[PDB]
Design a binder for this molecule. Sequence first.
Ligand SMILES: *[C@@H]1O[C@H](CO)[C@@H](O)[C@H](O)[C@H]1NC(C)=O
Lengths: 208, 208
Amino acid sequence: VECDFSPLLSGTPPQVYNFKRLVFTNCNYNLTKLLSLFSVNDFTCSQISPAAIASNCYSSLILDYFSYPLSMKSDLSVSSAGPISQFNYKQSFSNPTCLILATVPHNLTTITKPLKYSYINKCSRLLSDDRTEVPQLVNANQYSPCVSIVPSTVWEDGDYYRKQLSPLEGGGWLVASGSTVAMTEQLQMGFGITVQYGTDTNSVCPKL
Amino acid sequence: VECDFSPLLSGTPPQVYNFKRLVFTNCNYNLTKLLSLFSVNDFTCSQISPAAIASNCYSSLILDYFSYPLSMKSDLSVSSAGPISQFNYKQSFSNPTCLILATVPHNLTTITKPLKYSYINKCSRLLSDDRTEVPQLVNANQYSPCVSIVPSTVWEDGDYYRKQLSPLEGGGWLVASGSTVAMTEQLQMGFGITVQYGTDTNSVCPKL
Ligand SMILES: *[C@@H]1O[C@H](CO)[C@@H](O)[C@H](O)[C@H]1NC(C)=O
């Protein structure tokens, strides 16, 4: 009962490529209660509406959250080759999904701002001819291949990261670069919601 | 006239974190001559080519040199994943740069070898909540913060270095650790060249 959204509200939210995932089964939610704490700037979904997602019964509810600047809202779409959607964060194309951009108010003191917003601007793989670069696109529900060599906070805008791969990995080099965006007055976050429907398993139902 | 590259030839070159920086203005260089003294093993550039950096006029020419083993060439190509560009040395993002990895030949007698190669493997900041490590990484065209606690040669591999920082710089600790690599028969060095272009001030020109 009463699925718990506190860990979203405690501490510094990770950057987009290090998004923290919360999974909910066999409990009951009030989504609009959580969103009342925030200034909601954007709310868009796919195969579901904002009204429907707050009042439907699921077999599973996944909620990713991270720090995200409102400047880069257009990067959060697969239509455009934005670095975020190619290399940092990508939602399932086969489940109903929603994406929420929100501003943490000042009265909400339990969330703490990082120094800045970081993100991966490139994650590619160098082939054995040492000439071809192949992009390494992030998959749905997975972190980027390049998170192993990119720190949780980009130190300097334009930093470059590389890792020599073993024969078991396929050879070549894994190359990444990170960029940073200046912190805003109030922290701005992203929230990705995914839901699954079952047959009898629909055990995440709204509270009333 | 008379850019002077000879101090690079007299004495013992420092370690990578103590790189000696020579700044040249209003003179005439012949870099090909300098490079003939050595047995160059790698010549890599950014926003400039080796042909171009030898035959162009600049408003400033910065030359850094230090002792560096060739077996750590991989520790260079990783850059912000490895500790050399985190803690020891990082060239400009904003001006064009080249990095040359060279061997001292025996004919060169005025360059004496040091005991071993030393580099900083960790330089972080313990807070006063006595776990908190916050790394203190290097910026472009700057030295590591932890030089002030690290000797010119790391005595033994793994040595730790701590100094408490005063309340007026902030309070807590500054810890660092060092790592060593056995000296080779013939000294191996590394050269970093950075160039700036001026409006009319491009006085540093090649010799004709
Ligand atoms: C959720 O909580 C809000 C107040 O924060 C309330 O207005 C709303 O009716 C609640 N919704 C449900 C489904 O319990």
